[PDB]
A paper describes a structure:
The virion is composed of a structurally distinctive capsid (called core-antigen) containing the genome and polymerase, and surrounded by a lipid envelope with embedded surface-antigen protein. Capsids are composed of a 183-residue polypeptide, the first 140 residues of which suffice for capsid assembly. The assembly domain is also unusual in that it polymerizes according to two different geometries i.e. T = 3 and T = 4 icosahedral quasi-symmetry. Accordingly, the same polypeptide chain exists in seven quasi-equivalent environments (A, B, and C in T = 3 capsids, and A, B, C, and D in T = 4 capsids).
Author numbering:
A (entry chain B), D (entry chain B): 1 to 143
B (entry chain A), C (entry chain A), E (entry chain C), F (entry chain C): 1 to 142
Write the structure that this text describes.
Amino acid sequence: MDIDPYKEFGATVELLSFLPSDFFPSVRDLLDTASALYREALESPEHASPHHTALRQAILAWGELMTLATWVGNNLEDPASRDLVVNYVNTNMGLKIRQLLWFHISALTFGRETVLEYLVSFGVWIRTPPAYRPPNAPILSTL
Amino acid sequence: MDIDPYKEFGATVELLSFLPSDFFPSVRDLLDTASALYREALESPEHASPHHTALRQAILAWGELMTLATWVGNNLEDPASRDLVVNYVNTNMGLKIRQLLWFHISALTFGRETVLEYLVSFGVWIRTPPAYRPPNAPILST
Amino acid sequence: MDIDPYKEFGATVELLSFLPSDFFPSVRDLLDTASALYREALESPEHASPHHTALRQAILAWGELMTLATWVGNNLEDPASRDLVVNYVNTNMGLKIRQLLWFHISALTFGRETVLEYLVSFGVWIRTPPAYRPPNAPILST
Amino acid sequence: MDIDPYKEFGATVELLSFLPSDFFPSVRDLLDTASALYREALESPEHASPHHTALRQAILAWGELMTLATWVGNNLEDPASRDLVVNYVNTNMGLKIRQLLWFHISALTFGRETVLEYLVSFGVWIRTPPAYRPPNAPILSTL
Amino acid sequence: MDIDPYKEFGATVELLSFLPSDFFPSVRDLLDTASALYREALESPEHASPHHTALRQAILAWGELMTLATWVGNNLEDPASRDLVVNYVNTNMGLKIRQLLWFHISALTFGRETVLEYLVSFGVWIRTPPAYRPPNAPILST
Amino acid sequence: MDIDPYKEFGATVELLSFLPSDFFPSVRDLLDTASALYREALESPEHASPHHTALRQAILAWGELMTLATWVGNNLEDPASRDLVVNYVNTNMGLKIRQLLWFHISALTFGRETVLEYLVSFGVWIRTPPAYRPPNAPILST
C-alpha cells in the first residue's frame, strides 16, 4: 500500500526523492561496506537498534534480486529482455536499495540526527541554483 | 553476505526450511490483513517494535518489484520472457518475501515466543508419518 | 550389558515399545530440525543439559554408520549384500536411533515431563479400539 | 552435521585423532570394565554426571552394532561382504567407540581435568620422535 | 581452523579486503619504517604490547620468504617456475603481509580506534561518488 | 633489522637451534593439536596472552605458504623447480615454523619457565654421554 517507510526515523521519501542519483555509491560497495563494518554486529541475536534489522532485511532482498538477475541470465533466451531486466534491476531498484542502505549505514555511523540535519543542509545547498551555490556540497561532520 | 536474517528474532532460516513452501498463503490476502490490522503502526513516526520496521522495508521491496514486473511487461516484446520473469517474481522470490512477511505479521499479532512454539510444533507434526498423523495441523491462536 | 538406556530421563524402553514403529519420522527431517534449532548448543563447550550430551553422541554414531554404509558400498561386489546391509542400517538400527533422537529432541524443545505425559496419552489413545477412537492422536505443543 | 562432540568436555577430535590405535583396549574389555565398575551406578534414575549419560547411549549403540554383525552373519551369503563388514565394524567403528568409551571411563575414574592433562602430556611425548622420547610413555597418576 | 589474525584487535580480513589493494604500499617502505622507528622495541625482549609481537613474527616470516626466494634463485635456474613462484610471492603473500604490517604499524603509531575509524571513513569516502565526496580524503592524525 | 621473535619470551633462536631438529615434530601434528585444543581461544577476538597472538600470525603465514604451494602445483607443471621449491618450504620454513609452534603451544599448555628449564635440561641431557645420563630423558610436567 501507500506506507511511508522512514516515518519512524524522521525522514520521508520526498526528502530523498530530492537528492541526485550519482551521490549514492555503488551497490556492491554498499554491501561490502556494511559487511566489513558490522559482520558480527549483524549476525548476532540482538536488535540493539532497528537500523540493523531493516538493513538486514534489505540485504536479504538484494541477495534475492541478484539471484533473480543471475537466474534470468541462466534461462531467458530473448537477449533484449535479459539486458533490459538486468538494467532495470541495477538502475531503479538499485537506486531505491541504495537510498535505504546508505541511509541506515549513515544513521549507524554518525547517528540519525546528524544524517537528518545533513540532508536538510544538502537540500538547502541543492535547491540553490548554480549561480549562488558553493562549488562543493556539504559533508558529514560527525560532530 | 553471510547474513542470518532472523537471528534477532530468536529464529533461524533452518527453522523455516522446515515448514513446507505450499503452507504459506498468497501475498495478496496476507498483505491485505497486514494493512487492515496495522495501518496506523506502519504509518506512524514510531518504531514501536522492530517487527514493524522489517515489515515496512519488506513492503517497500515488494511494491518496488511489483513495479518492476509491471514496467517489464510495459516494454518487452518476447512474451515467453515476460511470463518467465513474472513467474520468477510471483513464485521464487515470492517464497522469500512470504516467509519474511508471515513471520513478522504473526509475531506482531501474537508474539515471538508463540511463533517459535508454533514452528516447533509444526516440526513435530510434519516429521510424523501420515498414518499416525493428526487430522489437522495446528492453527495458532492467542 | 543390562543397560536401561532412558533410566535417567524418567522414562523406560517399555514405554517406547509402546508407541509403534511407523509413528517416528524420517531421520533426515529430524536431524535437520535438530540442527536448525540447536546448532549453538551442540557446538558449544557447555553441557547445558544432559539431553544435549546424549544427542551429541547419537549424532556421532549415526554419522559414523552413514560412513560405514558408504564405505561398504564403496568396496563390495555382491549388490544383494550391499542392499541388505544398507537396509539393516536404514531400517532396523534406524528405529533405535530414531527413538533416541526423537525422545531427546522433543524433551529439549518442550521438556521431559511433557514428553512423559505425551507418551502416556498416546498409550491411552492407541490401546483404545478404532471405533471409539479419536480422529486425531495428540500432537504435542508447549 | 559437523558437530564437535567433546567440545563441552574441553577436548576435541584433533586431540584424539592424535593418539595411536593400539593404545585403546579391546571393546569387549571396555564394556566389561564399565559394567563391572558402574552396573548399579548406570542403571539408576540419576544423571549425576553427563559422562554416565553419554556412556550409556554409546553402550546402547555398540549393542545395536553387535546385533548388526550377528544379524549380517545370519543372512548374508556373500562371505567377502560378511567378513569385510564385520572387520570394518570391529576396526573403524571399533576405534571410534573405543575413543568415546575410554574417554568417559577415564573422566569418571580420574576426573576430566586429569585426563585432559594426561592427553596433553601424551601429546608432548608422541610429537617427539624416537631419538629423544623417553622409552616409556606417561601414565595416569590420579593425583 | 577459523584463524582470523585481526579478531582480537577489533577487525577482520574482510574489513581489510574492503579497501583497494593499491592503497597498501610496497613492503620495502613498511619494513624500512618499522626498523627506523622501532629498532629498540623490536630488539627488546619484552612483550610490551601484542602489536609488537605480531609484528615480530610477521617480519620473521617475511624474511623467511625472502630467504626462500634467494634459495630458489641460487638453485633453480629454470625461469618459468621461478617467475611464477616470485609472482605468487610478491602478489598474494605480498598483499597479506602489506595489510598486516600497515595495520599494526599504524595502530602502534596512532592507535587502534583511530585506525578502525579511519578504515570506516576511507571506505565511505571511496565508495561515495566524486561530485559530493569531501574535497580531500581523510588521513591519520597523531 | 635485529628481529629475534623469542626476545620477549625469555629465549632466542640459538637456544632453539640448540636441540636437534628431529625432536621438533611434523607441522601437521602441531596444527591439529592447536586447533583441537584452542579452537575457541584462536577464534576469540581477545588479546588474552601474546603467545596466542604470535600463534595466530604464525598459522596465517603457514596457511599462506600452503596456499603458495597449491598455486604452484596448479600452475607450474615443471617438476624440477617445483620440487626444489617444495623442498625449501618443507625444510627451512618447516623448521622455523615447527620451532615456533612447538615453543608457543608448550608455553601455553605448561608455562614459560617450564619450557625454558626443559630446554636446558634436555640440552645437558643429550650432550651428556649415555653411560652416565639419567635413564630416561626429561619430559614436560603439567
